[PDB]
Every structure is written in C-alpha cells, then in structure tokens.
C-alpha cells in the first residue's frame, strides 16, 4: 500500500517514457504503414494538482530512429524518422 | 540514432508505468477532486505491428494508494483508493 508522499512524488509533472503512435506524430504521411507502428519517446506526463497550472515541456530535442516504412501493394524499406522528445518539464500558468 | 531492432523491442506490447487520471478511472466520483489528480499504474502500453492483433491484459492485479480526497467548499481528507494494474500483456485478435 502506497503512502501518499510516494504517490505524489511519482505522479507529479515530469518526463516519462511514453509510447506514441507514429501516425499521430506525422498526421499527413499517408502513403506509409509503420513497423513498429509506435515508438518510445520521452514526453511530459503527470499532474500539477493546482487549478492555475499545467504540465508542459521547457527543453525539447529530437531523436532519430530506424523505422521500416511499408508502402502497401508495393514494397518496404528501412529509413530514418525524427521525433520530438521532452528533456525538461514544469508546471506553468495556463 | 536508434537502430531498428532496438526500437521494435522497446515499443512492443508490454506493461509500462502510465500516468492515469483518477476521475477517468472512477467516473462515478463526482463530489471529489483528487490530489494528486493522476496516479502511476503499470498498464499495457505498446503496439503489436499487425491489424489482426491488439495489446491487451492477460493478468491483472489491484494496488491501493493513499489519495487526498477534496470535497469542494467543504473540506478534505486522506483516504485509500484501489486501482487496476496490468501485470502481463500479450498480443491478441478480436
């Protein structure tokens, strides 16, 4: 049974390995189906427990990842794709 | 630059710590605000890389956490609250 302090510290706004669908992050790229179709990205998650504030990134960077980009009825080929990561996170006024 | 196998193997369907909103998990608790508002739960996360399959739990288990339960314009008190956890995740069809 998880003591309140521990719940609080672990849920509070911070960068966390999130699994993010490639098609969400690249809305327009329609001629491809991705394998894996999702990737591990460091993104801000959690809560600020304060009506005025919200969890948002304050330092961002990119990471490039080999992805099998499959073109239906055609073929497939490895290729690089870049994605936004969050290095730092803070609770800021809305 | 993350090599293919590395990405696939790290985004494959598995239990990942996931920050989940308490209100979403308990829609019936209209008269409380929660502090923290979200909790870290292990939950099925990734993708299965096939549209014949889907990421689902095969082994569940509950964990109790201490949540601070605010009744708006009234008061607040600490309380225990149970949440569902995914212990083993596997790739299934419909």
């Amino acid at each position: 049974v998880v003591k309140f302090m521990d719940v609080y510290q672990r849920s509070y706004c911070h960068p966390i390995e999130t699994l993010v669908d490639i098609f969400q992050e690249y809305p327009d790229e329609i001629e491809y189906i991705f394998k894996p179709s999702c990737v591990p990205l460091m993104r801000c998650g959690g809560c600020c427990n304060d009506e005025g504030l919200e969890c948002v990134p304050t330092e961002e960077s990119n990471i490039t990842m080999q992805i099998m980009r499959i073109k239906p009825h055609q073929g497939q080929h490895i290729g690089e794709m870049s994605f936004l990561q969050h290095n730092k996170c803070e609770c800021r006024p809305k | 630059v993350v090599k293919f196998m590395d990405v696939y193997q790290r985004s494959y369907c598995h239990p990942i710590e996931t920050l989940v909103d308490i209100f979403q998990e308990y829609p019936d608790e209209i008269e409380y605000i929660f502090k923290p508002s979200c909790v870290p739960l292990m939950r099925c996360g990734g993708c299965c890389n096939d549209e014949g399959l889907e990421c689902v739990p095969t082994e569940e288990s509950n964990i109790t956490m201490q949540i601070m339960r605010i009744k708006p314009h009234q008061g607040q008190h600490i309380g225990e609250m149970s949440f569902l956890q995914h212990n083993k995740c596997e790739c299934r069809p419909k």
Partner: antibody, heavy 122, light 107 residues
Framework: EVQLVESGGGLVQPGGSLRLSCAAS????????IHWVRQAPGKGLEWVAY????????DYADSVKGRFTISADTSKNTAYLQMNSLRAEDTAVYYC???????????????WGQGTLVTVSS | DIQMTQSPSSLSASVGDRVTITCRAS??????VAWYQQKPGKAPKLLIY???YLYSGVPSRFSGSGSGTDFTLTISSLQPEDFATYYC????????FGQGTKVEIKR
C-alpha cells in the same frame, strides 16, 4: 555497368567454416540493398540474407540464423557471407544480388552475380 | 520462415497460349510480391515487382495482378523464349521464395 562477382566457394566439411565474397562495381554498396539467394541442385531458389550497410541492418532466413553473417566492407565495395557450423544440406550455388532504387522494394532483386558452388561433404 | 506455395508446380503449354501462375503467401494484406524468370544454368532475372509493375526491358506480353495473399502472373502469348522456371517472392521479412513453376514445352 553494374557487376556482382562472387568467390570463395569450394569444399567445406561438416561443422566447418567458409567465407563468401561479392565484389560490386558500377554502384556504391554502402547506400544499397545487397542480398544472398542460394539454390541447391535440382531445387528452387531460397533467399538467405540481406544487408543495408548504411543503416547497419541485417536480416536472415530462419534456416541460417545463428550460423551465417552478412557484412560489408565499404572500402572494398564487397559484401561477405561468413558461413559457420555448416551441415551437408547447405550444399548450393550461392548468388549475391541487389535491389536498386528503381524499385522501392528492398527485395526486388534487380542485378545478380553468376553464382558460386559450395559443397559441404566429408 | 514464411510459406510460399505456387500452383501449378509444373506445366505444359504451346507457343501462343495464355498462361496463369498462382502464388499463395502467409503474409499481411499490405505485403506485396516480386516475380522472377530463371533458365537452366543461369541467374534469375526480375520480371515484375510491386505485383503489377513491369521491370524495364521486360516485354509487355507479361503483366501482374492480385494483392495481399494471392498473386497472378500472366503471359498473354507464350514465346519460345518464355520456357523457364518462374518464382514468386514476398516483399516482406523474411522475403521468402515460392518453390518454382516450370513451364515445359508441349510435344
């Protein structure tokens, strides 16, 4: 014009090793898709391995994983196949081939060597 | 591996015929195919990739069709040159071959 020339075939005895070479001219193997397809006598084509050297990515058929190793030396515009732990049924003409970028497909094998016989027998 | 069955395994036609080779694949519906020709004592030569697309230099007499699971090669008017063994191949991982379909001449 594009050329793919194999060598290093010959005798091997069971549980022994032998490296296969593939000398490429007319194109840069580092940015390319190189394959090895083999074929036992009287029998059909089996795909055996694949490299995209600039991606550092290799794939193999399940019938050779653990034993075989495709690689490439950029400086020698040559690809290799290290074959270890060879049983008798690995006896085959071994082609090296490529898929050029005329096909998006990584596996639409477009140019080919003349092949090289490898006999595994005691 | 992945399984690739070819039907028929062998054949017997004459010059001028219509020919149809089928190809079965244990692969996703989005995964495509290639077609090769191989004559005795020689290397194969790519005919068609991406199911339907004519690799340059290949006579129009050849064309392709099908998708996902099942695939059909088609020679409209068979020629003396067209007597060979024809293989199909997955364009996925692994990129496994079919077992080959021999066209022998009819006497």
């Amino acid at each position: 014009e594009v050329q793919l020339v194999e060598s290093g075939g010959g005798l091997v005895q069971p549980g022994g090793s032998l490296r296969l070479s593939c000398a490429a001219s007319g194109f840069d193997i580092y940015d390319d898709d190189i394959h090895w397809v083999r074929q036992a006598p009287g029998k059909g084509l089996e795909w055996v391995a694949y490299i995209a050297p600039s991606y550092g990515y290799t794939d193999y058929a399940d019938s050779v994983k653990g034993r075989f190793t495709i690689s490439a030396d950029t400086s020698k515009n040559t690809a290799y196949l290290q074959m270890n732990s060879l049983r008798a049924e690995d006896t085959a003409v071994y082609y090296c081939s490529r898929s050029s970028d005329a096909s998006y497909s990584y596996s639409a094998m477009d140019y080919w060597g003349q092949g090289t016989l490898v006999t595994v027998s005691s | 591996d992945i399984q690739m069955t070819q039907s028929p395994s062998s054949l017997s036609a004459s010059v001028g015929d219509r020919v149809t080779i089928t190809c079965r694949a244990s692969q996703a519906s989005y995964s495509s195919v290639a077609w090769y020709q191989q004559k005795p004592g020689k290397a194969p030569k790519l005919l068609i990739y991406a199911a339907s697309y004519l690799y340059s230099g290949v006579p129009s007499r050849f064309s392709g069709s099908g998708s996902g699971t099942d695939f059909t090669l088609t020679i409209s008017s068979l020629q003396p040159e067209d007597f060979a063994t024809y293989y199909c191949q997955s364009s996925a991982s692994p990129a496994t071959f079919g077992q080959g379909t021999k066209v022998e001449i009819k006497r």
